[PDB]
Nucleic acid binder design. Structure first.
Lengths: 119, 100, 105, 52, 75, 47
RNA sequence: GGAGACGACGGCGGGGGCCCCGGGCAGAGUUCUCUUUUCUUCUUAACGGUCUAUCACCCUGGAAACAGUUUGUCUGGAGAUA
C-alpha cells in the first residue's frame, strides 16, 4: 500500500521530519485505512506511529586586548588611590601620564613606584 | 526607627533613622515630587510618603512601591492613617478634605 | 547534615525469581564509588534490605538516583535482563524494576 | 564461547554510524521470546502467562 | 491585562454592568490565589495570597455573576 | 515636636532648623530607673 | 518650527538572542572489561503597569604647583574639577 500521505501527515502532526517518523510494518493495513489527522493521532496514541529519537552527537591573546585591559586596571587603581587619598591631584596626573606610557607593567609595580614616590 | 522629612532635601528629603544603631539611611531616592510628610502604617511594615500631589505607599520588607494614591488636591498639607490601616485623610491648602 | 532515602523495588522480579536481591546488594557493595574509588563503603553511603523485597540506601554525600539507576542497569544486563526489564521512577526516590509491555502470540 | 556469542549479538545490533533506533519501551515483544529467554536463564514459567 | 491588589476595587469591577466573565485560579505549588474578571475591554486579575480571604471574596461576589473554578487540563 | 510611642521610656524628639534633638524632659513621671532606662535606650547604639 | 528626512567606515561600551561549561529531575543508549557514564526536555508572545540612562541641560562655586579623561582622541574663564 502507498503510505506517502500517511508519512507526510504523521510528520506534520508529530512536528518532526519524514526521516523521524516510523510506521509499524505489521500494521500497514490499519495505517493505510487511517487517512485523517485525527486517525493518525489515534494511531500515534496507540503506538503504531512512533517518533524516533535524535541521532547521538556525543561531544566528550592580541596585544590590543592586553593593552586595553592593563590600561583599564591601572587607571582603576589610580582612581581608587586618588579617592582614598593615598595620592594627590598632581602626583595622580604624573602617574596617569607615566602609566599611559609603557612604564608600568602590573599593579604591584605601580604600588612600589608609589612607595618610592611617597618615600 | 523614626523617619524625618525635609521638603528641600531633593533626593535626601526622606530619611529613616534606626536608633538602636545610630544609622540614618535614605531608602527612596526618587519620589516624583517635593516631599511634604511621611508616616508609618499602624500594623504592617509600609511607609506612606506624601508629596505635593500624591501619597506613595512603599513596602519596607522589599523596599518597593506597593501603591500610589492621588487626592484631587493642588498642595497637600497633612495626612493621617486610620488605626485600622485601610483609610486615609488628606488635608490640603485648597481647602479640601479628602477621605481615601 | 542532610540524609537521602533511595528505594529500589524489585518485588515482582523477586517473586518471579528472576532477580537475586543478595547478588544485587553485593554488586552495589563493590561498585558504589565514593571519592572516585570503589570500596569506600564508610558511614557515608549505607545499604540494607527489607524482608518484602526492596533495597534501601541511606546516602549522606550527593549519590544521585541516576547513579543508582545506572548501577541497576549494569546489574540487569550483567545478568542479561536488560532487553526484558526496565526501571521506572514511580515516586520521588523509588525506582521500580518492572517488565516491558508484552504482546501475546 | 559465551563471551564471543554476546559480542557477536552486540556487534550485530550495533550498526556502523549512529542510526536512530526505536526505544525498547516503544517496541513490543512476544510471550514466546520472553518465556524462551527466561527459561534459558532458568525461570519457572507458571509465573507468567496471564500478562498481556 | 491589569493587576489588582485591592478587594473592594475587585468587587466594584465585578459589579460593573459590563463585567462579563469570572474565574478562580489556585496555584498550589506557589500557594497563590488569583481572581480573574473579564470586563469587556480589559482582563483584571486580583492577587489574594490567602484562602480565608479567598472564601470571603467568593461568598461576597455578586450572585448574578456566576463565579466558577477553572479545571486542570484545559480543553 | 513628637513623642516616642513606647510607654517604657520618656523620650521627646524635636526638629528645629536642620537639626533633630532627642531629649529627656524633666517631668514628675520620670523615676531614676525610668531616667536611666531612657538614657540607656538613647546611648545604646554608640557601639 | 519640529518629526517624516536619510552618507560610508573604524574600534569601544550597554542590552537581548545563539554557541560553550557545571549542578539537579525525567527518559533513552553503550556496557566481555572500563566509564558517579553519552544524548535528549527543562520554553514564555503581543499588549498594559512599575523600576532602570549614556549624551544633553540646570544651580553653587571659581581653576597654572593646570586639571579632568578615553583603547584611541580630546575638553575647560565661550566656566573645568567637585
Amino acid at each position: 500500500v502507498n503510505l506517502r500521505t500517511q508519512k507526510r501527515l504523521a510528520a506534520s502532526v508529530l512536528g518532526c521530519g519524514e526521516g523521524k517518523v516510523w510506521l509499524d510494518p505489521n500494521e500497514v493495513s490499519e495505517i493505510s485505512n487511517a487517512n485523517s489527522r485525527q486517525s493518525i493521532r489515534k494511531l500515534v496514541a496507540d503506538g503504531l506511529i512512533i517518533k524516533k529519537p535524535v541521532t547521538m552527537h556525543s561531544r566528550s591573546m592580541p596585544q590590543q586586548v592586553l593593552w586595553m585591559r592593563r590600561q583599564r586596571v591601572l587607571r582603576r587603581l589610580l582612581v581608587k588611590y586618588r579617592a582614598s587619598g593615598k595620592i594627590d591631584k598632581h602626583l595622580y596626573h604624573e602617574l596617569y601620564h607615566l602609566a599611559k606610557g609603557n612604564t608600568f607593567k602590573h599593579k604591584r609595580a605601580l604600588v612600589e613606584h608609589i612607595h618610592r614616590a611617597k618615600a | 526607627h523614626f523617619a524625618t522629612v525635609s521638603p528641600s532635601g531633593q533626593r535626601s528629603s526622606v530619611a529613616i533613622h534606626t536608633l538602636s544603631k545610630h544609622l540614618t539611611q535614605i531608602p527612596f531616592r526618587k519620589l516624583n515630587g517635593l516631599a511634604q510628610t511621611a508616616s508609618f502604617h499602624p500594623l504592617r511594615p509600609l511607609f506612606f510618603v506624601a508629596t505635593q500631589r500624591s501619597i506613595r505607599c512603599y513596602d519596607l520588607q522589599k523596599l518597593e512601591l506597593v501603591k500610589i494614591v492621588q487626592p484631587g488636591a493642588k498642595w497637600i498639607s497633612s495626612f493621617d492613617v486610620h488605626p485600622g490601616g485601610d483609610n486615609l485623610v488628606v488635608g490640603s491648602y485648597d481647602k479640601r478634605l479628602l477621605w481615601h | 547534615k542532610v540524609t537521602k532515602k533511595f528505594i529500589i523495588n524489585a518485588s515482582q522480579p523477586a517473586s518471579d525469581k528472576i532477580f537475586d536481591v543478595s547478588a544485587f546488594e553485593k554488586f552495589l557493595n563493590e561498585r558504589i564509588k565514593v571519592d572516585g574509588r570503589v570500596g569506600n563503603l564508610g558511614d557515608v553511603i549505607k545499604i540494607s534490605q527489607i524482608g518484602d523485597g526492596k533495597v534501601e540506601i541511606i546516602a549522606h554525600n550527593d549519590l544521585s538516583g541516576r547513579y543508582l539507576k545506572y548501577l541497576t542497569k549494569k546489574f540487569l544486563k550483567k545478568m542479561q535482563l536488560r532487553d526484558w526489564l526496565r526501571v521506572v521512577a514511580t515516586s520521588k526516590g523509588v525506582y521500580e524494576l518492572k517488565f516491558y509491555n508484552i504482546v501475546n502470540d | 564461547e559465551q563471551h564471543a556469542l554476546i559480542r557477536n549479538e552486540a556487534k550485530m545490533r550495533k550498526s556502523l554510524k549512529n542510526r536512530a533506533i526505536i526505544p525498547r519501551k516503544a517496541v513490543k515483544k512476544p510471550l514466546s521470546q520472553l518465556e524462551d529467554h527466561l527459561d534459558q536463564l532458568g525461570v519457572d514459567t507458571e509465573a507468567i502467562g496471564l500478562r498481556a | 491585562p491589569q493587576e489588582v491588589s485591592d478587594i473592594k476595587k475587585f468587587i466594584e469591577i465585578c459589579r460593573r454592568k459590563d463585567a462579563s466573565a469570572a474565574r478562580i485560579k489556585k496555584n498550589p505549588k506557589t500557594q497563590q490565589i488569583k481572581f480573574k474578571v473579564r470586563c469587556q475591554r480589559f482582563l483584571y486579575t486580583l492577587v489574594l495570597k490567602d484562602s480565608d480571604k479567598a472564601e470571603k471574596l467568593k461568598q461576597s461576589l455578586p450572585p448574578n455573576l456566576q463565579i466558577k473554578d477553572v479545571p486542570k487540563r484545559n480543553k | 515636636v513628637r513623642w516616642r510611642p513606647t510607654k517604657d521610656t520618656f523620650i521627646l524628639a524635636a526638629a528645629a532648623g536642620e537639626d533633630i534633638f532627642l531629649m529627656i524632659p524633666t517631668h514628675p513621671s520620670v523615676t531614676p530607673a525610668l531616667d536611666q532606662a531612657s538614657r540607656d535606650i538613647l546611648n545604646a547604639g554608640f557601639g
